[PDB]
A paper describes a structure:
Ferritin represents a class of natural protein nanocages, which is an iron storage protein that widely exists in nature. The ferritin nanocage structure endows it with unique functions: the primary function of ferritin is to store iron while playing an important role in detoxification of iron and oxygen-related radical products in vivo. In this study, for the first time, we demonstrated that the ferritin from kuruma prawns (Marsupenaeus japonicus), named MjF, has a pronouncedly larger ability to resist denaturation induced by Cd2+ and Hg2+ as compared to its analogue, human H-chain ferritin (HuHF), despite the fact that these two proteins share a high similarity in protein structure.
To obtain direct evidence for the binding of Hg2+ and Cd2+ to MjF, we tried to crystallize MjF upon mixing with heavy metal ions (Hg2+ and Cd2+, respectively) by screening a wide range of solution conditions at 20 °C. Eventually, we were able to crystallize both complexes of MjF plus Hg2+ and MjF plus Cd2+ with good diffraction and solved their structure at a resolution of 2.3 Å (I4 space group) and 3.0 Å (P6322 space group), respectively. The refined structure revealed that a total of 24 Hg2+ are bound to MjF nanocage through a metal coordination bond. Hg2+ binds to the thiolate groups of Cys13 with a distance of 2.4 Å, while it binds to Asn123 with a distance of 2.2 Å. We also found positive electron density map around the ferroxidase site, but it is not clear that the electron density is occupied by Hg2+. The side chain of His63, which is an indispensable member of the ferroxidase site, has double conformation—it may be accessed to bind with heavy metal ions. The binding of Hg2+ to Cys13 and Asn123 did not block the 3-fold channels of MjF directly.
Numbering used by the authors:
A (entry chain E), B (entry chain C), C (entry chain D), D (entry chain B): 2 to 18, 20 to 56, 58 to 99, 101 to 172
Write the structure that this text describes.
Amino acid sequence: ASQVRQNYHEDCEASINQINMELYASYVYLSMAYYFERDDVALPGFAKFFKESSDEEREHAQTFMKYQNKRGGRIVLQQIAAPSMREWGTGLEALQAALDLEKQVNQSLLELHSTASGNNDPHLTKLLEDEYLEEQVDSIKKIGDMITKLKRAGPTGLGEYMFDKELN
Amino acid sequence: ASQVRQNYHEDCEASINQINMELYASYVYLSMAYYFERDDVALPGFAKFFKESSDEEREHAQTFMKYQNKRGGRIVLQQIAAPSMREWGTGLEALQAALDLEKQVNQSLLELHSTASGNNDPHLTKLLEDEYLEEQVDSIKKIGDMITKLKRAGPTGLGEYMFDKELN
Amino acid sequence: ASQVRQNYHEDCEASINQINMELYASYVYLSMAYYFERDDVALPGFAKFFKESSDEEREHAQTFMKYQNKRGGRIVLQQIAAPSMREWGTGLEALQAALDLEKQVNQSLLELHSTASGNNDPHLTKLLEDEYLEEQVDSIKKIGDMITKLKRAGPTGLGEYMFDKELN
Amino acid sequence: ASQVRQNYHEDCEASINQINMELYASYVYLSMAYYFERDDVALPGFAKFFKESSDEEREHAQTFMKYQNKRGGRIVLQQIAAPSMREWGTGLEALQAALDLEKQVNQSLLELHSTASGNNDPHLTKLLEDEYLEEQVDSIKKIGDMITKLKRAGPTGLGEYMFDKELN
Ligand SMILES: [Fe+3]
Ligand SMILES: [Fe+3]
Ligand SMILES: [Fe+3]
Ligand SMILES: [Fe+3]
Ligand SMILES: [Hg+2]
Ligand SMILES: [Hg+2]
Ligand SMILES: [Hg+2]
Ligand SMILES: [Hg+2]
C-alpha cells in the first residue's frame, strides 16, 4: 500500500471514486448553461448561474481527487454520462431539475459520510462536513428560494424575463 | 429614594417600564424578518426592512431603560409575549400588521405623554416628543406609503416581486 | 414538507426552536447591563461586558433561526420569560449567575448535539460544534478567569472598582 | 417696550434675571476647582472636573442673557454671592455639596418652566427643556454615579487617590 496510507478503508476509497457524480453534476449544469444562451431561449442570467454551478461542481470533483491522493488512495476515473435530457424547457423547469440533482448529490454525500463514520474515519467525516455538506445545504436552500421567487414573478413571460435580470 | 430622583412620579416610572412594549415590537419584527427568509416565501427586501425595524425598536427599549436610570427610576423587566402569529401571509398583510402595531405603540406613547403632562414633568414630555413621537409619526407615514405602493404594484404576483426589490 | 428539507428530523427541528433559550439569555444579560448603570451601582465596565454578552446571545438566536430556514424547518417563536431577578447584587454575584447560565446553555447545546448524532444529522452536529460549542467553552473559561480575578482583587470595595476599569 | 417683545410676560423676564443663580453656581465650582489645587489637597481630577463645571455654569448664564435680549427683556445683573465655604472637605463631601446644588438649580429651572407654562410661553418652555433641563438631569446622574463609585473605591485614602485619577 501507499507509504502515506493510514486508517483509510478501501470502502471509502472506492466511495470517493462521488468524483464521477460531481463531474456528472458539472456536465448537467454545463448543458443548462448553453441551453440558456440559445437564440430561441436567450436567458443570460440563467446561463451565468448555471455556468458558475458547472465550475463549482468541477472544483468539488477536483477537491475529491486531491483528497484521494492525500490519503494514499488511487483515483479511478470513469466515463461521464451525458444528461438524458437536453431540452431543459423553461427556467423554472431547469431550476426544478437542478434542485432534484443537488438533492441526489447530497444524499450520496450523506451516504459516504455514514460509511466514513462506521469505519471510524474522522478525517473523512470532517472533510465531508466542512467541504461538501455545508455547501450543499446552502445551494439547495438558494435554489429553493429561486424557485419560490420565479413562481411569484410569474414562471413564464414578463416575470421570467425580470427574474432572469436580477440573476445576471 | 435614589439620590438623583427629582420631580419623578411613580406613575410615570411604571409607564416607562413601554420598555416591554418596545421589546415586543422588536420581537414581532424579528419574527417577520425571518418569515420572509423562508424558502417558500423568499422576499429578501421585506426581510431586511423588518430586520432593520427589529434592531431599531430594540434600541428604542434601551433608550427607555437608560432614561429610567437617569431619573432614578428602577427597571422592572417583564416577560416578552410571543408575536401574535407564526406566519404573516403576504407582504401586504405584514405591512398592514406593522401599521396596526406602529399605531398601537404610538397610542401608548401619547398616553405616557399625557401622564407626564398631567404631573408636570417637562423632561419626560421632551424625551417623548424628541425621541419617540417624531419617529413614530415618520414610521407610520412610511409604512402607509409602502402599503399604497404595493397595492399599486399588485399586492401579489410580479408586483410583489418588483416592490420587494425597491425595498432590498 | 418544504422543497429543501432532507435528513431533517422533527425532533431536531423542535429542539432548534434553543432559539428561545438564546433569546432568554440575551434578556438576562440586558437586565444585568442596565442594572450596572444604576446610579447606586455605577459599574460601567460590568455594564459594557453584559451589553456585549446580550448582543452575542441575540446573534446566536438569529443564527439558529437562519439555520431553521436553511434546513426547511419552521421557526416557532415563544414568549421570552422575564429574568428571574430585578437586581443582581455585587459584580461577583452577577458573574456567578452568568457562569451558571452559560453552563446551563452549554448542557442544552450538548443535548441537542446528542440528538443530532443519534439521528445521523452531520450537518447539524457541524453547526453545533463550529458555531456554538466552541464559543460556549471559551465564554465559560472567560467568566471563570474573571471570577478568579475579581476574588483576587477583593470582590468588594476598591478591588471591585479597579476590576471594573480593567473590564471597561 | 422693545420693538421685538411679543408674548413675553414680566414675571418670566424677572425669573430669567436664574442668570444670578447660574453665576453663583459657576462661582461655587470655581471655588471647588482651586480648593482641590491646594498643596494640602492635591486632587487634580476633582480640580479639572469642577473647573469645567464652573465654565459650563457661566455659559448657562450667558445663554440666559442672550435669551433675555432675544425676547426684548432687559438684563439686570445682581451681586454674585460668595460661596458659603472656603474649604470643601473631602472629595466625597465636595461631590455631595455639588449634587445638592445641582438639584437646587434644577428645582429653580422647573419652577421657571411652570411659570412659562402658566403664561403660555412655549418659546421659553422650549428653551428650558432643550438648553437646561436636559443638561441638568445628565449632570445630576453623573454626580450620582461619581458618588457611588467614590464610596466603592473608599471615600478616603488610596480609593480617593485612584478615583481622582480616573477623573483626570
Ligand atoms: Fe458538488
Ligand atoms: Fe419603537
Ligand atoms: Fe449563546
Ligand atoms: Fe446651569
Ligand atoms: Hg469506510
Ligand atoms: Hg406621571
Ligand atoms: Hg434529531
Ligand atoms: Hg411667565
